[PDB]
Amino acid sequence: MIINHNLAAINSHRVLKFQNEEVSKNMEKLSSGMRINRAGDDASGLAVSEKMRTQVNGLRQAERNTEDGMSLIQTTEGFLQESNDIIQRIRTLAIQSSNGIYTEEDRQMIQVEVSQLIDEVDRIASQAEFNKMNLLQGDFARGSRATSMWFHIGPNMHQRERVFIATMTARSLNLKGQSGELLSLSTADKSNDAIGTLDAALTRISKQRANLGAYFNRLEHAAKGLMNAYENTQASESRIRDADMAEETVAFTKNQILVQSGTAMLAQANVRPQGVLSLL
Numbered sequence: 001m002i003i004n005h006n007l008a009a010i011n012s013h014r015v016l017k018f019q020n021e022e023v024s025k026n027m028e029k030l031s032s033g034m035r036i037n038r039a040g041d042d043a044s045g046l047a048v049s050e051k052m053r054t055q056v057n058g059l060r061q062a063e064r065n066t067e068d069g070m071s072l073i074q075t076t077e078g079f080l081q082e083s084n085d086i087i088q089r090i091r092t093l094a095i096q097s098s099n100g101i102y103t104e105e106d107r108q109m110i111q112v113e114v115s116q117l118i119d120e121v122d123r124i125a126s127q128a129e130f131n132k133m134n135l136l137q138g139d140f141a142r143g144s145r146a147t148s149m150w151f152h153i154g155p156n157m158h159q160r161e162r163v164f165i166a167t168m169t170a171r172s173l174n175l176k177g178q179s180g181e182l183l184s185l186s187t188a189d190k191s192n193d194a195i196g197t198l199d200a201a202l203t204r205i206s207k208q209r210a211n212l213g214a215y216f217n218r219l220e221h222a223a224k225g226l227m228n229a230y231e232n233t234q235a236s237e238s239r240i241r242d243a244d245m246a247e248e249t250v251a252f253t254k255n256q257i258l259v260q261s262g263t264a265m266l267a268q269a270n271v272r273p274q275g276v277l278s279l280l
Contacts, residue, residue, distance in 0.1 A: 001273060001276050003276055006269065006270070008272060009266060012262060012265050012269050016259065016263060019259050019262055020259060023255045026252040026255055027252065029243050029248050030243070030245065030249065030252060032243070033242065033243055034241055034243055035242060035243040036240075036241050045241070046241075048240055049237055052237035053237060054155075055233050056233050056234055059226055059230035059233060060230055062154055062155050062226055063223055063227060065151060065153060066219050066222050067223060069153070069163070070219045070220070072130050072131075072135075073215050073219065074216065075130050076128070076165060077209060077212045077213070077216075079124060079135065079136065080212070082124055083168060084202070084206075086117050086120055086121055086124075087121070087173075087198055087201050087202050089117060090114060090183075090194075091195060091199070093113065094192075094194040095195065097185045098188055098191045098192045098195070099188075104187075107188075107191070108186055110186075111185050114182070114184075118170050118175050118182050121173070122169060122170045122176070124136070125137060135165055136168040137167065138166070138167035138169075138172075140165040141164060141166050141167055142166070148162060150163070153219070161218075164211070165212075166204075166211075168208065170182075173201040173204060174197050175197070175201060
């Protein structure tokens with residue numbers, strides 16, 4: 001028997017060391033909880049998982065953006081509500097002032113309230129704000145040269161939609177003139193003519209409310225779609241990257257038993273050449 005080299009021990013050790021490497025890979029997978037932990041396990045799977053992680057993060061952020069845009073729209077509509085109520089009050093006052101039983105003094109008394117209400121409309125226009133941004137002054141109007149409002153409702157580069165808000169000053173409503181002269185109710189004839197102007201202003205405010213309502217409805221649908229897409233994308237990403245722990249435990253236990261058996265066989269092969277010494 002050859003004792004200068006122990007080939008059985010060499011073979012047993014080689015098998016054992018590669019079994020130990022397999023055990024280490026299993027432990028990595030079990031402690032992290034992810035099937036892919038280093039490049040090499042599945043390169044294309046890792047690339048697809050990273051793209052899907054980008055998509056998941058973007059879908060969550062886009063849903064948050066959609067909620068924020070919803071909040072902005074809701075604030076703007078809430079601001080328009082007060083203006084609509086004020087214009088309704090002014091129209092009722094114009095109906096009353098058209099009657100012939102009133103003198104000029106009573107019409108001036110009505111014009112006092114008209115002046116206060118028109119000033120309140122202008123105050124709403126110039127002071128309605130969202131995150132230090134004016135909403136009703138025409139900054140986001142269709143032909144505006146100041147700025148534009150965009151909502152980024154998608155996880156990718158150009159997935160954004162534009163929102164237009166028109167001007168609700170007493171001027172775009174024709175309650176204030178070019179030189180700043182207020183709408184007048186001080187005479188019966190002018191009060192009668194003021195009914196049509198107030199009707200047109202109510203029409204403009206209603207159109208603006210309809211536009212914002214449509215914007216909100218669309219944002220609702222977009223948010224529901226974004227949540228559904230995010231759930232599906234998380235399902236796909238976890239199906240590609242996350243480890244199944246039952247299978248991993250099975251493989252780990254098998255490799256542990258193999259390591260134990262290989263160690264026993266290495267110990268057995270180490271003492272094998274001791275039988276030669278009986279011949280010396």
